[PDB]
Structure formats: structure tokens, C-alpha cells
């Protein structure tokens, strides 16, 4: 019939048909369960909440993410999310559609084998495929050469590609992303006396981060600007109607991407990680990688992120190289767009792992076909 | 620097690669565009070449229907280059990684393998090209593609009509006169690719009616003589009362109005010195006999001696009835049967022009819009698209006097397309409903 | 019709038509193969890169020269290069053109037989001929008396000719040429910390050699000059924008031609080899040989090479002899130019090995007719 493209991110689920230009379903990758006594008749009859229903009823629920750092850690809740995706958000029978899934690089091999077994046995898909998220971001952009910086909710990774060849030895991966920035914002919000401690309040801090945070082009004078003047302060309204104000945490939160030591990590920032990934590549392709820095994922949506990456990589390159960062407005769905993109190609229709192949090699067939 | 240097290369490649009917979907259609490099680098022409002898092969949309995404457009280059079993790129040195972008030397020479294995109206102007092939006596080549299949008969007739780069001059010698040297490469001059030899020889020979008024002739007399000439009698009738005296032209007209003539009773134009007057008298008597009984004409007090002596009243009495019969035949042969009508034929031009869509339309043959030739010139090219020829037409800027020129132009080439118009241009310039109707009927004769 | 002249050097391929004043095609004699993982669908099914296209995509390729020291060591890649030169760079059908090939002296006989078999069975050219490169270099100068010093990428050889007669017993051959100077420049570039190790980086060092190296007129004075002052220092920019500087290595590289012991060889320099070739000739013709020292090949293009050879041979001559060095600007194509001159002679048209002769005597006919 037609292929399905499900980009199971850590924080959000992107799903839809191949050939469309945007995911049909975009919902949080969460499962909610009740935490209070059912004093009202008929309201207590539902034991689990999956999609946006878990987010709207979070005041009486405990929220869990089935994926952390791009690794599926709860498989039964992941199956709840997959059933919700196929049968409630897309409303399709998976037995009729080949399904294209995505994954981060340098991931454990069992994650890819278990999701292959789940699609073939629980959902009985006719065929399936697992693609690297950063490669799909190139499939989204316009390019067969370039280094991709992907930053979603769980993982930040860099993949350099030249003429459709990857350099795996130069692939970088960092377990620092949006969820860690939210947790850091939660910690620094206590300096003003705000406290957020439940899982529901974590979603409130996520909304604050997505609404009032930005990347400073220079952190030291923004710190002085916020220390002297009030012009950087902004207000946010809590669900009970209380109002909070932040004027320094707005850029101190996203600064962790460039200074991971704010959360005790020894690793270098995303700019240095991109530069080191380029310097591991062959010297004859570095000029073309310097001119093609593709940004992808929701964590790359901060205002000023591309300008700061431009300034930092320029500060690291040999000056003669023309540094260019590409940051399309659809950065939030580049991986999904690339998946629907790849799944449409007629040359790809033989690359699917069919169920007949899986019946011979088992779940290990995914390591050979993908 | 040089803004262009290789449009001739595009033409040359088109000439040589037209052996495969589908290759022009990648290489240019002979307009000297640059679409060749990118799609040839994908190797699409390699799989196209199978269509040369057998179209039942890899279809253009079966291999690539743009299932190549907007940003990763890698896939098709390998899918089409892997089909190089056809023709075969010797140069086992390159391939898909490099041909993704292409290189000038690489492309020029892989095209060299392509060239190495690649090879193993029009007739109206072509007849003035082939008439000389008859010489003392031989068959005609027609175009240098249909009759000739090898250089044997071609050279044999070239001897009478007198490295491929120098052999093509043997055929281009008749083209040298007007400078038609290029755009017809020697490979297909020798190979005889059809579509190239058709237009080349047609356009080469493209440059290769008496509407006067006498000092004393009425419009009726001029119309009679005009239809004499238009009907195609063997003598060129200049004077009605001076060419019909032998009745030979009248007997010819009888054949044209479908009245049978027994020429064994007709004395041939080579009359013997003795008795020529009697022979002509016999011919006039036979013409009168064929005009009275089988032609069914009212000829009271007319005898053969009257036509022999050229009596104008009785001769006009016969030629106007000839007009009547011929016009009736022209109105009837357009029908399914004996019917003749004016309003079933006047709307035909209005509805057949809708096949192309032009602003001419006429309500009746008495309409004043047909005072200029715009309506006839609009209709005259609708059935024959090869005679558009709006070079000499006038529109809106015409006066009383200049429309005579376009009227004559449309009436003259009506006979070129095949409409046997036997009308004077004046009969079209004026709103004479009895004759413009015949003009339209003749145009419809070639129409349907 | 028109004979084809193909001078298959170790480093560059020179091809064209007899009667022309210069070769029409001059491209590197290399074959490239992908060295990295393809990740984008149907980008990568190309196996071999050969000409300038193998040089532009060298950042993802392993480059192989099919000819080493004037011996064809890979006959399948050599067939690829011959296919490339006949159809892509010259753009002709070989069945319609007699082909003139070149070869170094004292070469293995099977090399000449194999190229004859390839030309008559793979391309089935109507006729062919294999000529000595130094003889063609004499034809290009218009002379009929003189000793030719040919130095290309793989072999340096000396051939003395008098009144159109060669002296085969005085032919001398040295397996030291431009490629060995490149590898030695790479070896001595590490003394400043510049490391080049991939086959793609060898092309960069070759470019550096062709742009900054020169022959010292006195090696010990230039060494003292570079040891005192930086006035010999010069800079070069790498493809990633790094800038390297070399002073002393500029002339220590080409000095190996006069002192082969730099690369551990026991053989004498090109000046002594030329003098020894003259001293093996008859004493009556040595005066005419001393006045006609013809150089050819790209390795003879270094600044100061003719002045150094003039001074060194003058130091070896009986002083009363007039040493003359001939070093035309077209030195890089003298072999091809002389081959087009020879192939355009009407008297040469009966020297072609025809296919009928080969069909009877086999590949061994080349030893008789050439
Ligand atoms: N405009 C924005 N500003 C800051 N952070 C954002 C913005 N949009 C999304 N994010 C963050 O990006 C993450 C979601 O990005 P996404 O690419 O969907 O990750 P995943 O695919 O792993 O679910 C969340 O942490 C979210 O808070
Ligand atoms: N200007 C130059 N200075 C020094 N070396 C050069 C120069 N130009 C070319 N070369 C060297 O000469 C060789 C060029 O190849 P060539 O002389 O054609 O040998 P072959 O005929 O064996 O391919 C290479 O070793 C190249 O590095
Ligand atoms: Mg994600
Ligand atoms: Mg050489």
C-alpha cells in the first residue's frame, strides 16, 4: 500500500505516511498513570494514558518516558506508544504497511534488534527498515555532502558525509540534549525561589524552556547585562495562575550546550564536537564539510544557536575556510521528512527487510540490511 | 570570453543518436540546449538505446518516475548507469561516482563510444529535388532515406545528379548553392536518417495565376474563362470565342461535369490540311449533341455550326448552363446524396474553426465580414496546418484597395492545398452570395 | 587515416594524433577506489575512478598507479586507462587508427609483448608500433646526433645517437625518477612535523614538489645559506587551509638526482651516468655527444637543472671539450612530439606492425619489427 515513517524520538513521536511533507501525528512520547484516589464515579476506570491525554491530565498522573538517551528502556510502554501511533493517531493496520523506523548512531545493537522483532511479531508488518537520524536530516536538506548536527530530547550526534559516504570513525555522540537542559533549568530556577519537583512540573519547565530560553552570542556580556539591567527579564504563568519571572536563566540554560561543565560533564561543547568531527575526516573533504553544517532536531531551535555556532566554528577553523551553518525552519522534523523522503524512493523498495527474510535470519537481519 | 562554442556538437550528437527514438528525452530535441550533461551522466541514454530496434524494453517512467527525493537525488545515477550493457562504455575507468557530476573529456569520449556503436509539405518541395534523377532513365531516390539503403544506388544516381566528412559533399553539392552546409552531419547523410533528410531537402527547394483584365471583357465572360482555366482543360483558354471553335475544350468540360465523351468520334487537334473545317464542324456537332441529350441543356435554336462560327449568344447559353451543372455537382458531391443546401455548409466553417480556435465566424454568405479574405484565410489553414502563412495577411489596418492582395493570396494557395476554387478574387472581395458559397464548398471538398 | 600517438608514462598519459604539435589528452595515470561506507541510496555503485576524476574525489579514494618504473604492473587497470584514453580523452574508435606506443629501454620483453596483445585483441587496432622514448625525444629536437637524458616519473635513462645510429652497449638506465623524489620529500617533510601518509596526500606532496623544489648549483653552499638565513623559506597552503613552510627541503629533494645515496641507492648521479654513457662511445664521436646533451621529461623541469648538469659534466670532461646542454621548454612532451613526427613520416608507414603479421607471428613480432 504505502510506507509508514515513524521517528521515535526520546521526547516526541513523529509519524506519518511516506510522500507527505510533514508528520501526520506529533505527540509526546510518554505514558501516564494515576497517582490519587478515585473519589468521583466513573472517572477512575482508565488505567493508562499515552499521548496528549497524559499531558492534559498530568495534574493527577505520574509521567514516564519509555526512551532515554535514544535507548528504549520500557518496552511495554513503547508498545503502548506504537499501538497508539498506529491504531489511534494514524488509524492504520500495520499489517498492510511497510514501516520505516529511525535510530541514533553508536546505539546498542539490541535496541535495533528488539524493535525489529516487535514490528515483525507484535505488529506483523510486511517489511521494515531502520535508518540513521542524521543521514535522514541530509535527506531533508538538499545535499549529498555535509556534516549534520542532530540534537533532540536525548542525544546530540554529529555525522560527516561526503558524496554519500559516511566516515564512521569521525561520527560523534553526546548524551546531552533537551531533557538535560530542562533539568538544568529546573535546578537554576530555585535561585529565584521557584520549585518544580513532580513529573508534571517538569513538563511545565519544558514549556518555559521552549518559550523563554535563547542562546547568547556572548555569554559574559549577557551575564553582565542581566546583572546590571532588568531588560532581559520575562514572565510566565503557572497552571494555578501564579506568575514567575526569569531574566538570567533564559540564556544560562542553553549555554550548557556550549559549556557542558554546567551539569558536571567533562565533554566539549557542540561546536568543538563538530570541529573535532571535521578534523577526523580526510583533509581533502574538510573544506566541503566546513561549508555544510546542517542543524537538526528540536534542541537546535533556540534563537541565536546558528549565529553562536558560526562564531565558534569560525574561531576554530583556519580562517581561510568559509564556515556555513544551515538551519532550516523545519529543523524540528528534518529526520521525519527525510524518512518519508527515503521511503518514497522506488530504488529503496528492494532495501526493506521483508518478513520472509526475518523468518530465516531472525532479529539479526537488521544489522546486515541496515 | 566566448559565450558559446559547442552548439554544433549538440546538433551532431542529435543527428547521430536519432537512431534511438527515445534518446531525445535526455539529449536536446535539436534546439541547442544543455540538458545532455546531467541526464547522460545519470546514464539514462544507456538504457534508452535499447529502444533503437525494439521499444519493448526499459520504459522511461518504469526506471525513473522521479522517485528521487527533493534532497537525496543519488539513486537514479546507479539505476541508469548499471544498464551500460547496451552499447558498452569501453572506458572501464569511470562510472557512477564521477558521472554524478561529469567531466568534459570523460563525457565527450563516452559519447564517442555512443557514436561508435550508435549506428550500424516535404514531398511537394522534394519533387523539384528528385526530378533531375530521371536523367536518361532511372528510378528516383525521393528523399535520401527511403529508396536508398546503401551507397550503391545512391552513388549510381549521384553520378547523374552530381572519410564521411568528405563523402557528404557529394550530396551537399546541391546544398552548396544556398549555403546549406551545416546542421546535417555526414554520418546521417550517408546513413540516411529519415526526418533529417525530409526537412533538409524540403526547405532547400522551397524557392526553386492569370488575374488580368482585358480591354473589353464583362465579369460574366471573365468568370467563364477563369473557370475554364481553373478546371484544368488542356488548352489555356484565353478567349472564349476563339478556343472553343474546335469543341475539344467543351468535350473536356463535359468530362469534368461527368458527361461521357466518346473521343473516337472526336477529331484530334492535329487536323489534316484537307477537310479541317469539316472535322471541326463534326466536333462541334458532337459537342452540341452531348450538350442537348445527356447534359440536359436548354439550347433552342442552337446547332453545331453556331459553336463552329462562335455565336456569342448561343455559346453563352451553353457555358452558363455548364456553370450551373458544375456548381450543382460541387454542391451535391459534398453531400451523402442528391441534396444541396447553403445553411448546412455555412456553419461548417464556424464549427471546424473551433478545432483551433480563431475569432472568425460568419452567419451567412451575405455577411459583410467576408469582404476581406480574413474568413477564407482563417478556414484555409485549419484543415491543413502546414499553410499557416500569416506573413502577407492584414488585420484591422486593411483599406478598400489593399484587401485585393490578401484575397488573391488566399485564392491562389487554395489550389496549392487542394481546394479547386474556380472563383475570381473579385467574386470574393464583393459579397456575391452565389460565388463565395462555391469558394467555401471547394474549401470543404478538401476539408472533410 | 590518422595515426594515434599514446605515450604511456608512469605518472602521466600523453595521447593525441600524429601531425599535431602537442598531445590532445594529458591526465594522471591513476585508478581510484572507494575507501568508506556508502550510506545514501544508489549513490555509490561506482567501483573505479581513473583520470582527473580520480584526482578530484581523492578524499574518499585509494589511488593506484598501474605503471611502476616504466613496467605495467597492473594490466587490468592499464586496460582501464587505455579504454579511457581511446574513448574519453581522445574520442576515437581504435579499429580505425594505427596506434604508436612508447617504452623505456632495457625493459622486460614481456611488457612489450603484452601491450601488443592488448592492442591487437582488446582494441584490435589495424596496426601498431612500440618506440623508445629517448629516440622520440631526439626526433622532437630535429637532431640526428646527441645523447638524450630522459627523466619522467619512474625511469631515468641515457641513449647516445650518432648520425642516426644508436649505440646500445652505451645505453644506461636508472630506476630513480620523480616519484622517488616525491616519496623522499614526504620522508623529509616530517622533520618540520608535516605528516603526509595517504595516497591522496602523496598527490599533495607531488604538487608541493612541482611548485617549490629547485636544483642547487652548489649543494653545500645552499645548505649553509639555509642554515644561516630564512631567505630560502617558502609557504604552501593545504586543501583544508593549513599553511606549511619549507626552506631546506626545496633543494634537498632534487639533489637526490645527483646524490642517489639520499634514498639509499648505490648508483651514481645523472651527470655521472651521462658522462659514463659518453665514455662508452667511440672517442671520435664523444666531441659531438658533449655538444648535444638533450634533456626530456617532467623531472628535468626543476629550476637550475641545466646549469647544474652543465657544471657537473664540465667538471668531468677533458676541459678542451665544449659542453652544451639542450633543455627546450617543451621538455615535458618531447617523447610525444617526436612520436607524432615519426608517425607522420611517409617512410614510417611501412614500419607499422599490421594485424596480418601479428595473426601469424603472435605477440613476438614486436621484437623483430621494433
Ligand atoms: N523552540 C524551542 N526552543 C528550545 N527547545 C525546544 C524548542 N522546540 C523543541 N525544543 C526541545 O527539543 C526537544 C524535542 O526535540 P525532538 O527533535 O522532537 O527530540 P526527539 O526527536 O528526541 O523527541 C525537547 O527537549 C524540546 O523541549
Ligand atoms: N615543474 C616541475 N618541477 C619538478 N618536477 C616536475 C615538474 N613538472 C612535472 N614534474 C614531475 O615530473 C613527472 C611528470 O610526469 P612525466 O614527466 O610525464 O613522467 P611519465 O612520462 O613517466 O608520466 C612527475 O614526477 C612530476 O612530479
Ligand atoms: Mg529526537
Ligand atoms: Mg615518463
Residue numbers in the entry:
A (entry chain C), C (entry chain A): 5 to 374
B (entry chain D): 121 to 240, 269 to 310, 332 to 377, 388 to 627
Manuscript text:
After picking and reference-free 2D classification, class averages were analyzed by projection-matching versus the plastin-decorated single filament map. This revealed both parallel and antiparallel actin bundles, thereby directly confirming that T-plastin cross-links actin filaments bidirectionally. After 3D classification, selected parallel and antiparallel bundle particles were subsequently processed independently. In both bundle configurations, ABD1 and ABD2 bind their respective filaments in a similar fashion, with CH1/CH3 both oriented toward the filament minus ends. We thus speculate that the checkmark and zigzag conformations are the two bridging configurations that satisfy the spatial constraints imposed by the CH2–CH3 and CH1–CH2 linkers while also enabling CH2 H1 to refold, both of which can be accessed with approximately equal probability due to the structural flexibility of ABD1 in the prebundling state. Consistent with this model, we observed that the end-to-end distances spanned by the unresolved segments of the CH2–CH3 linker (parallel: 13.5 Å; antiparallel: 16.8 Å) and CH1–CH2 linker (parallel: 29.6 Å; antiparallel: 31.2 Å) are highly similar between the two bridge conformations, despite a 50° difference in CH2’s orientation (Bottom). However, the conformational landscape of each configuration is distinct.
Here we focus on human T-plastin, a member of the plastin/fimbrin family of tandem calponin-homology domain (CHD) proteins. T-plastin is a 70.8 kDa monomeric protein that functions as a key actin network stabilizer, strengthening and promoting cell protrusions by localizing to lamellipodia and filopodia. While most cross-linkers bridge filaments through the dimerization or tetramerization of subunits featuring a single actin-binding domain (ABD), plastins contain two ABDs (ABD1 and ABD2) within a single polypeptide chain, each composed of two tandem CHDs. They also feature a flexibly tethered N-terminal regulatory domain (RD) consisting of two Ca2+-binding EF-hand motifs, which inhibits bundling activity in the presence of Ca2+ while still licensing binding to single actin filaments by unclear mechanisms.
